[PDB]
Amino acid sequence: LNFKAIEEKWQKRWLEAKIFEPNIRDKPKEKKFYITVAFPYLSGHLHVGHARTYTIPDVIARFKRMQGYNVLFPMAWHITGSPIVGIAERIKNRDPKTIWIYRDVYKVPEEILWTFEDPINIVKYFMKAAKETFIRAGFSVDWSREFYTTSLFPPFSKFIEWQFWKLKEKGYIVKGAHRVRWDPVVGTPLGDHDLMEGEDVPILDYIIIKFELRENGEVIYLPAATLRPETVYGVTNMWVNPNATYVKAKVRRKDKEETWIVSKEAAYKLSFQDREIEVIEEFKGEKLIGKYVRNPVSGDEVIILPAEFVDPDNATGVVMSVPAHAPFDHVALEDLKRETEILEKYDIDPRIVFPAVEEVNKLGIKSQKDKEKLEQATKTIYKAEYHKGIFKVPPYEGKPVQEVKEAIAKEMLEKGIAEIMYEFAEKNVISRFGNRAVIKIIHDQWFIDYGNPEWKEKARKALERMKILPETRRAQFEAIIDWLDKKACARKIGLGTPLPWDPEWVIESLSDSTIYMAYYTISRHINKLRQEGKLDPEKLTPEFFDYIFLEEFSEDKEKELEKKTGIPAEIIHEMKEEFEYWYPLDWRCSGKDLIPNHLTFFIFNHVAIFREEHWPKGIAVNGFGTLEGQKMSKSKGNVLNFIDAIEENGADVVRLYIMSLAEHDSDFDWRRKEVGKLRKQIERFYELISQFAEYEVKGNVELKDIDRWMLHRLNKAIKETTNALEEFRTRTAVQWAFYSIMNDLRWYLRRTEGRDDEAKRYVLRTLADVWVRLMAPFTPHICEELWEKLG
Numbered sequence: 202l203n204f205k206a207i208e209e210k211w212q213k214r215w216l217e218a219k220i221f222e223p224n225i226r227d228k229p230k231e232k233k234f235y236i237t238v239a240f241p242y243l244s245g246h247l248h249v250g251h252a253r254t255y256t257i258p259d260v261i262a263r264f265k266r267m268q269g270y271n272v273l274f275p276m277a278w279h280i281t282g283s284p285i286v287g288i289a290e291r292i293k294n295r296d297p298k299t300i301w302i303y304r305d306v307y308k309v310p311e312e313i314l315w316t317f318e319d320p321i322n323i324v325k326y327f328m329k330a331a332k333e334t335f336i337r338a339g340f341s342v343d344w345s346r347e348f349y350t351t352s353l354f355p356p357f358s359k360f361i362e363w364q365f366w367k368l369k370e371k372g373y374i375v376k377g378a379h380r381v382r383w384d385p386v387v388g389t390p391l392g393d394h395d396l397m398e399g400e401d402v403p404i405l406d407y408i409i410i411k412f413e414l415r416e417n418g419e420v421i422y423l424p425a426a427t428l429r430p431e432t433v434y435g436v437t438n439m440w441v442n443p444n445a446t447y448v449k450a451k452v453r454r455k456d457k458e459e460t461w462i463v464s465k466e467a468a469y470k471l472s473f474q475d476r477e478i479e480v481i482e483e484f485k486g487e488k489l490i491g492k493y494v495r496n497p498v499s500g501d502e503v504i505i506l507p508a509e510f511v512d513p514d515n516a517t518g519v520v521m522s523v524p525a526h527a528p529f530d531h532v533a534l535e536d537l538k539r540e541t542e543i544l545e546k547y548d549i550d551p552r553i554v555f556p557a558v559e560e561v562n563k564l565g566i567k568s569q570k571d572k573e574k575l576e577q578a579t580k581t582i583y584k585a586e587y588h589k590g591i592f593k594v595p596p597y598e599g600k601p602v603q604e605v606k607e608a609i610a611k612e613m614l615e616k617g618i619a620e621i622m623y624e625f626a627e628k629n630v631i632s633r634f635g636n637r638a639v640i641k642i643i644h645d646q647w648f649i650d651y652g653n654p655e656w657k658e659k660a661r662k663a664l665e666r667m668k669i670l671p672e673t674r675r676a677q678f679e680a681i682i683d684w685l686d687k688k689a690c691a692r693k694i695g696l697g698t699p700l701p702w703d704p705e706w707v708i709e710s711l712s713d714s715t716i717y718m719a720y721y722t723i724s725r726h727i728n729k730l731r732q733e734g735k736l737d738p739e740k741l742t743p744e745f746f747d748y749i750f751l752e753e754f755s756e757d758k759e760k761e762l763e764k765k766t767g768i769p770a771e772i773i774h775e776m777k778e779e780f781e782y783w784y785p786l787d788w789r790c791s792g793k794d795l796i797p798n799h800l801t802f803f804i805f806n807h808v809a810i811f812r813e814e815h816w817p818k819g820i821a822v823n824g825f826g827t828l829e830g831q832k833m834s835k836s837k838g839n840v841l842n843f844i845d846a847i848e849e850n851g852a853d854v855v856r857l858y859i860m861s862l863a864e865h866d867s868d869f870d871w872r873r874k875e876v877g878k879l880r881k882q883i884e885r886f887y888e889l890i891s892q893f894a895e896y897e898v899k900g901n902v903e904l905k906d907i908d909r910w911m912l913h914r915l916n917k918a919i920k921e922t923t924n925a926l927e928e929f930r931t932r933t934a935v936q937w938a939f940y941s942i943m944n945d946l947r948w949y950l951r952r953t954e955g956r957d958d959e960a961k962r963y964v965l966r967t968l969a970d971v972w973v974r975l976m977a978p979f980t981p982h983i984c985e986e987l988w989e990k991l992g
Contacts, residue, residue, distance in 0.1 A: 202884060204851045208982045212336055221341040222725070225782040227271050234270035235783045236262055237718045239791035239799065242279045242710070243327040243349075244288060246307050246842040247334060248833055249871050250792075250826035253859045257823055257931060258790045259340045260860060263978040264926045266341075273783050275721045276335060276342045278328055278349040282710040283392030283695035285320045290395065290633055293318035302835050307842070320696070324349075334844040339852050339981045346724035350713055351696045355738035356727045360720045361698040361713050363746040367810050369702070373653060375687055379646035380404060380623045383473060384632040385639045391632050392694030399630035404640055407516045408610050410619045412439065413495035414462070421449070422461045423494050423505070426516030426622055429583070430613065431606040432523040433498045434594045435551040439505040440520035440533065443486035445513035451479040462489070464518025467622075473641040474623060486513075491541055496521075497618045498609075507540070508533045510571055516624045525550040525558035526586060528578035532568035553593040559586075647706055648687035651805055657682055659808040660801075667804075668819035670929050671865035674796065678820075681801045688712075688802075711798055715806035718789070719750060722780040726772060740766040749777050751812065785815045793822040793866045821929045824868035826859070841871060853980035854880045860979055861935040886943060886972070887983055893969035894990040896962040907952050908964045914945040915971045922975045938975040942968070 215221060225233075238258040241247055247255070262274040291299040292314060303309045303317070309326070316322045328349065335342060352358045368374050382391040382404075394400050409424035410433055425439060441447070446465040451458060454476050463471070465483065472478040486507070493502045510529055511520050522530040536545055550558045562578040590602040597605040613619030623640040630638045650656070660682050669675045690712040691700050697707030730736040745766060748758050754777065759770035766773070789803055800820055807816050827833065833840040846855045858876045862869035904912070918937045925934035946968065953961055970991060977984040 204853060204983055207986045208337070208339070208852050211982045211985050212339065215339075215341070216336065216344075219345070221274070222343045222345045223271055223273050225271065225779060228269075230782055232270050233273075233782060234262070234265040235273045235718075235786050236265075236788040236790065237275065237721065237786060238789075239795060240277050240279045240714070240717075241331055242282070242284070243324050243331060244284050245303075245327060245835075246330055246844060248826075249828070249841045249843055249846050249855070249859065250833060252338070252843040252846065252855065253826055253869065254790070254792050254823055255335065255340060256338065256856050256859055257821070257929060258788070259338070260856075260931060260978045261788070261926065261929065262341055263981060267974070267977065272341075273343055273721075274341055275346040275724070276340070276344070277347055277717065277721065277724070278331065279710065279714060280324050280328075280353070281350045281695070281697045281708070281713050282394065283692065284394040285323050286392060286695055287395035287400070287633075289318055289320035289323055291397070294397070296397075298836065302838075306835050306838055306840050321353075324353075330844065334847070337844060337847050337852055338856065341981075343725070345728065346721050347728070348720070348724050350698070350717075351707075352698050353696065356731065356736070356741055357717070357720055358698040359738050359741035360717075360746060361708060362701045363741075363743045364713075364716060364806070364810065365701060365708065366743050368649060368806075371809055373650050373656060373809055374690070375648045375650045376645055377648055377687070378475075378642060378644050379648075379689060380474070380640050380642050381646070382630065382632075382638045383641035384634050384636050385469075385473065386636040387632070387634050390641075390643075390693040391638055392692065395633055395694050396638070397631040397633050397635060399625070399627060399638075402625050402627045402630050404623050405626055407622045407624050408613070408619050409517055409622045410521065410613060411461075411497055411617075412519075412521070413497055414492060415495065416492075418460070420460045422459060423489075423519055424461055424463060424517045424620065424622075425519045425521040426624070427521060429523070429526075429606065430610040430619065431592065431597075431602060432526060432553070433496065433521065433609060433613070434596070435523045435525060435553050436496055436499075436501075436503060436521040437524055437530075437548060437550060438503050438522045438534075439494060440508040440511045440522055440530070441486050441489050441505055442509060442511045442513050442518065443490060443507040444509065445486045445511075445518060447484045447486055447489065447513070447518065449481040449484060451477075451481065453477045462519075464513035466514040467517045470624070470639055471622065473639045475642040498613065506533075508570070510575075514628065516622055525552040525560065526582060528560075528563040528568075528575055528582060531560050531563040532572075532575060533570055535568065535570060554586075554590060646689055647691040647700055647703065649690040649712060649802075650687040651685040651802070652687050656805060656809060657685070660805050663804050663808045663816045667817055670819070670821040674793070674822060674866065677796055678801060678804075681797050682804070685801065711802060714799065715802045716810065718786045719780065719784065719811070722783045723749060723776045726776045726779065730768065730772065735767065737767060740768075748773075749780055750810075750815075754781075784811075785818050788819045788821055789817055790821045790823070793824055796822060822866060824863060824866045826868065827870045829872060830870060850876055850880055851883075853983050854883055857883065857935065857939065857976075857979045860931040861939070862932060864930045864932040867932075882939075882943065883980065883983070886939070886976075887987065889946070890969045890973060890987045891990055893962075893965045894987070894992070896966045898963050898966055899959060902958075902960040902963045904960050904964075907949065908960050911945065911949045911964050912967065915942070915968055918942050918945075919971060919975060926978070935979065938979065942972050942975070 236258050238255055241251065258274060262272050266272050288299060303314050348354055348357050350357060382393060384391055407426040407428065408430040409426045411422040411424050414421045414423050447462055448465050448468045449460065449462045450468050452461045468478050468480055489505050490507055492505050494505065495502050510533060524531040524534055552558045559582060562581055566578065568575065586602055592600040592602055592605045632638050664678055669678060690709055691706035692709050693706060695707055698713055700706040700708055745762055748762060759773045762773050763770040791800060804817060828839055828841055831839060858879045859869065918941050921937040922934050925937060973984050973987045973991065
């Protein structure tokens with residue numbers, strides 16, 4: 202029933218005797234097994250979905266120790282980035298939503314919570330929480346190698362500097378243009394997750410089509426912003442908010458200078474997007490109505506009509522109407538007033554398609570210019586049209602809309618007909634200073650150039666040589682490697698390691714976490730030196746790391762490194778032996794959500810820096826977990842913390858349950874009723890083994906047919922459980938290791954009810970030995986206890 206005592210007993214033994222801190226001398230390199238799993242970010246408690254991610258490698262590590270490998274399974278903490286910095290500030294301001302999440306979902310005591318205004322307290326609290334939770338879960342971690350990231354952990358920070366100098370020397374670090382969140386009042390870059398409000402909000406790439414308004418003036422453009430540039434071939438008129446203030450302005454870039462008319466808000470925004478803006482005058486909105494403009498694509502000339510649905514504070518403030526496909530434009534066309542002129546009803550709606558002018562929706566739920574919710578109509582159309590839908594218009598006859606959009610935009614762009622304006626999907630993006638953010642284009646953003654073709658090739662080579670579990674994910678990896686472009690690798694805000702040649706930037710979270718597995722190998726020695734007060738991180742130069750990771754052993758280099766570092770040549774030598782022994786990493790594990798980013802970056806960074814013999818050998822990914830049928834959401838409060846699940850059900854029960862539900866990229870669904878039922882079966886498994894352990898087997902026995910049947914079923918389960926685990930098939934392994942044996946055993950006991958002789962006791966005791974062994978990787982605590990009972 203209660204296993205709290207057994208779990209505590211075994212965790213104390215594992216920790217106090219440092220059972221899981223391996224010594225490389227115990228076995229030759231041929232029997233080494235090194236596995237790591239993406240370290241957690243310390244902004245809060247890990248939940249049961251995370252529990253799966255971290256339990257799989259533990260199961261495998263324990264399975265490997267049982268097979269005879271010398272195993273290393275370490276753990277460390279990620280604290281790089283701006284979220285923790287942002288969260289601290291929100292609690293400082295007493296933001297209701299943040300407070301509630303930390304109180305109700307994470308159960309942080311009230312008084313402790315206010316100390317989180319200092320991001321360092323958030324880090325310390327959740328570091329302690331994550332470590333205890335991993336120890337309470339029975340994870341067989343070599344804690345001597347523990348560390349955390351950023352400049353707050355000098356020795357690791359130095360290792361990161363080395364990594365980045367290496368990338369630089371190879372020409373993999375590039376400076377360039379980028380668009381970032383910016384506070385226009387303070388005039389300063391913002392942290393993406395250090396906002397007062399609007400952190401999920403994406404920056405959108407609006408295509409601004411420069412319609413031509415000609416009237417005695419040699420240069421006047423009315424840039425209409427659209428997310429459907431392909432609909433340029435069907436614009437029947439223009440939209441503008443007659444009540445909104447528009448400006449006529451001089452727009453110059455480099456040496457090109459034009460004159461445009463956009464909303465007053467657009468003019469301010471554009472000033473931060475690589476353009477000099479000088480407003481000429483405010484012109485209301487109605488002052489434009491009735492005017493005609495030329496469609497720079499389809500030579501047509503159209504009218505600028507009134508419409509209170511257009512938002513002057515969205516993109517340019519100018520919209521191009523396409524009623525056949527834009528619900529808003531249709532119901533907007535609906536007229537029945539006086540205005541100024543009326544030549545209406547004239548000119549139909551050119552379609553480009555299921556009716557020609559797909560206005561079903563905009564007439565399938567009623568309408569009216571601003572009844573709102575009109576977007577649900579545009580949602581369905583926009584969604585559909587993108588999926589299927591073939592282009593009607595001549596230039597792109599029978600072409601997929603998705604293709605036409607890409608082509609048209611590509612064409613207007615490299616012709617000057619259209620330009621790009623960045624805009625937030627929502628209007629509530631607010632900085633920590635309390636001001637609405639703007640998007641600013643900068644020219645000095647640092648990138649890691651994953652787009653380098655030579656680099657991509659070496660990455661394909663490394664991928665080819667490694668195992669991918671499930672193999673069905675190999676295609677996605679190949680595609681990510683082909684399609685990857687340079688990636689912003691540093692930020693102005695957040696905790697991290699300063700870019701060594703430009704300290705004003707700190708290396709970003711997905712960029713300081715691609716090869717730290719190499720650091721784990723030397724972490725025990727570094728921590729011992731550090732605790733001994735015999736370490737000056739400043740002496741951990743690129744030269745030192747070059748010797749450790751890239752050079753041939755040299756007693757002379759060790760001797761000269763000893764003089765420069767203050768670290769005994771022998772210790773330096775041992776550190777290098779740890780790395781040479783444990784690498785290459787046998788397995789890198791993580792959620793499937795890291796395939797497009799971290800996991801692929803992990804491959805690139807390894808081929809860019811390490812010798813070939815040290816490239817990764819395998820990646821195993823897992824799916825997600827939902828709770829009672831729903832996604833776990835902190836804002837909704839339906840999150841089950843891993844530590845709470847352990848307290849309530851027992852660690853072995855949580856582990857077996859989660860492992861039993863799914864394998865590879867399949868997801869699982871946590872159900873209280875199922876875990877309760879599994880717990881009862883685990884308790885029965887425990888009692889049965891305890892009962893069988895009392896039997897004493899004598900000499901040889903005379904087996905009956907049912908006994909031989911049972912013995913054969915045990916061998917079957919051993920084989921299948923082992924075959925499944927070699928492939929990280931945790932669900933299939935549990936079906937054999939736990940369910941099959943329990944099912945076979947129950948039938949065995951029914952068939953032998955009333956019988957009790959030596960042959961039967963021999964079968965049952967033999968089963969108990971086999972069963973505890975197959976279950977150990979899953980339920981390690983009760984299995985250690987049962988092994989003592991057995992003898």
